[PDB]
Amino acid sequence: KVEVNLAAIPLGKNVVVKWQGKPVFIRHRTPHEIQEANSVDMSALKDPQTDADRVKDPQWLIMLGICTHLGCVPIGEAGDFGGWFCPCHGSHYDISGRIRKGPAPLNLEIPAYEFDGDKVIVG
């Protein structure tokens, strides 16, 4: 059960923290990214999910940084969709962490988490 201090994370920055040996991605999204995420049509997604189905507070993107293809850790702020790129076999994820191109069949998984003031508790 990991506790992350959200107050420590700057504006448009990515933070990676360990939880059960798996990397947890946390991005403090910018207003523009939040719009980019919630303005995508389901027809363009192989794994249809709204940004709201994936985040509780639009400011905090919290997901397991495990590529759904074969398990590599996607690289932040890379790719053709403004999100993450998996160097292993070329999977591109958007700003909501959804699969947009590549062999990966699913969006980055969202672990269970609850907020508590300036800190979130992943687990």
Partner: protein, 127 residues
């Protein structure tokens, strides 16, 4: 980018039905959030009329609930407002807008239509 284009009769006679269409491009109605209708009275007092979800569920303001009917057409990607038995009361500029919903921050109307000004006049107008 999402765009909302409004169209319809900019003038109806009292006792009749006002019908406004809200065309959406760049995002499907069935894809997600909430699709609302609101009106702006000349006395500058915005009023929430109601909505239709991506599923097709309605939610109307109790003030007008018994008169209006907000339907949609997935094929053409546009939702409509139908306010029955209008009165000089219903004279306002109507707006259609999308509202997102996040379990923490709640609702928020992020995409607004151009705004269609309707007048409930007894006058004659060329259809």
């Amino acid at each position: 980018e999402v765009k909302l284009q409004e169209s319809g009769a900019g003038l109806v006679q009292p006792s009749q039905s006002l019908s406004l269409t809200c065309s959406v491009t760049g995002y499907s109605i069935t894809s997600g959030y909430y699709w609302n209708w609101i009106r702006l009275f000349p006395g500058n007092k915005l009023e929430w009329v109601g909505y239709i979800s991506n599923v097709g569920d309605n939610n109307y303001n109790p003030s007008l609930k018994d008169r209006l009917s907000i339907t949609r057409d997935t094929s053409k990607n546009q939702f409509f407002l139908k306010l029955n038995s209008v009165t000089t009361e219903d004279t306002a500029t109507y707006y259609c807008a999308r509202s997102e919903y996040y379990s923490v921050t709640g609702y928020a109307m992020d995409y607004w239509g151009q705004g269609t000004t309707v007048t409930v006049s007894s006058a004659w107008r060329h259809p």
